[PDB]
């Protein structure tokens, strides 16, 4: 078996492998997340907008369970592995405990796995960042964000990917308690943040939503075109 240490410390106390894994996330597609009052929005920028491509097989916004869903940025092949592990953990938590997992519980589990790949032999770190969003049993909108290192934080509105610095900056001076007043202003907020970074904004912006006690819904080409015209 391969047992060589891949991630090790450097002279100035840096884990090069983890920093190189975070560099891959910056080259990935932009994915923003906004936490509203009774709604959670996840928007992703479809870099490749090929017309010969089946859009249903390249989606970035998945579902971990009935109340938890997530988006990612970076290596697509790594994300799938992580998402499948998180899905298996959700069913395991529904078996042992007789209740659904909380958004922080699965975020903690995904972060725990990521950290393990940064301190194990014969394996490199995951090159993705996740934006776990969902609702707890009480009906509270949660928005967490994990990264390659294995550190997770709960946010109000966050963007990850290439144009995350810009989106975040724009979100900082746009996300208020009046900007997320309803279930339409939150959607208009996610689309606004994505529109200032996504080339030819409009048909290159997939976005799903999640309301309290409700599965996950992915707005289509027409639904999202009405929100993009409303803004103007």
């Amino acid at each position: 078996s391969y047992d060589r240490a891949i991630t090790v410390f450097s002279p100035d106390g840096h884990l090069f492998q983890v920093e190189y894994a975070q560099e891959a996330v910056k080259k990935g597609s932009t994915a923003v997340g906004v936490r509203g009052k009774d709604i959670v929005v996840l928007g992703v920028e479809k870099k490749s907008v090929a017309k010969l491509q089946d859009e249903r097989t390249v989606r970035k916004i998945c579902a971990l369970d009935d109340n938890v869903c997530m988006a990612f940025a970076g290596l697509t092949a790594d994300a799938r592995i992580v998402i499948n592990r998180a899905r298996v953990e959700c069913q395991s938590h529904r078996l042992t405990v007789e209740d659904p997992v909380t958004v922080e519980y699965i975020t903690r589990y995904i972060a725990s796995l990521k950290q393990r790949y940064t301190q194990s032999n014969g394996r490199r770190p995951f090159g993705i960042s996740a934006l776990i969003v969902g609702f707890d049993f009480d009906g509270t909108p949660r928005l967490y964000q994990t990264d390659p290192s294995g550190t997770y934080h709960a946010w109000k509105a966050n963007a990850i990917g290439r144009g995350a610095k810009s989106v975040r900056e724009f979100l900082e001076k746009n996300y208020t308690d009046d900007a997320i007043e309803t279930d339409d202003l939150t959607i208009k907020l996610v689309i606004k943040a994505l529109l200032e970074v996504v080339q030819s904004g409009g048909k290159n912006i997939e976005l799903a939503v999640m309301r309290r006690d409700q599965p996950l819904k992915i707005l289509n080409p027409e639904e999202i075109e009405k929100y993009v015209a409303e803004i103007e």
């Binding site: 078996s1 240490a5 410390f9 950290q115 194990s120 032999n121 997770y152 946010w155 996300y175």
Partner: protein, 231 residues
């Protein structure tokens, strides 16, 4: 290039030395031990205003009588924290009694140098943990404050500061510290020092505070409690 268990010309393991340099980049944590109890404080270092301050947890409860403040790589600390928690729960199950602060620290200090490539299985650490710990609890010997670092070396101290500004904080602890301080005085001095080595204006949501008195259990100061101590 070299292995992870390579000794240097002086006599120190490179890897361990490099992991000690990663502990001087994290937020500052301050521990003070008194006769009334131990008090732990640590800056949260909030990067953006959109992030939830409560999501950041640098002070954790190992047990009812033991608290823990960390610094450096927070993700590495979670692995150690869980070991400490299970260790104290095992002790209770086997001896029907609580574990001492010194015993817990020693048990968590045994994982420090447990890394290496060759002659090891899949579930083995490839590198050392890049994080320093500050254990503060209350046992049979009263309040106690131990400090553990990346090399697996743990000691006992009255007032220890870890993190990027530990060097500066240390000097202030040596000046404003005596062996007769009260728990309330320890807390005040902790916030003052923490307020000088910071960049952001220390508020009630910018820092974390916890004490462990002989009477009550590990308690984490609430926003109001922290706001009334800042006065």
């Amino acid at each position: 290039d070299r292995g992870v268990n390579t000794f240097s010309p002086e006599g120190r393991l490179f890897q361990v030395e490099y992991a000690i340099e990663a502990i001087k980049l994290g937020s500052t944590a301050i521990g003070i031990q008194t006769s009334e109890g131990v008090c732990l404080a640590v800056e949260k270092r909030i990067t953006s205003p959109l992030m939830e301050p409560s999501s950041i947890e640098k002070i954790v409860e190992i047990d009812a009588h033991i608290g823990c403040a960390m610094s450096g790589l927070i993700a590495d600390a979670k692995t150690l924290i869980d070991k400490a928690r299970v260790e104290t729960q095992n002790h209770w199950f086997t001896y029907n009694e609580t574990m001492t602060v010194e015993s817990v620290t020693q048990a968590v200090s045994n994982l420090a140098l447990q890394f290496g490539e060759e002659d090891a299985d899949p579930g083995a650490m490839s590198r050392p943990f890049g994080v320093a710990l500050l254990f503060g609890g209350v046992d049979e010997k009263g309040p106690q404050l131990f400090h553990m670092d990346p090399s697996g070396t743990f000691v006992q101290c009255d007032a220890r500061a870890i993190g990027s500004a530990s060097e500066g904080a240390q000097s202030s602890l040596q000046e404003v510290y005596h062996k007769s301080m009260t728990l309330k005085e320890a807390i005040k001095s902790s916030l003052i020092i923490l307020k000088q080595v910071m960049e952001e204006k220390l508020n009630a949501t910018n820092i974390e505070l916890a004490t462990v008195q002989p009477g009550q259990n590990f308690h984490m100061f609430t926003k109001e409690e922290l706001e009334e101590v800042i006065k």
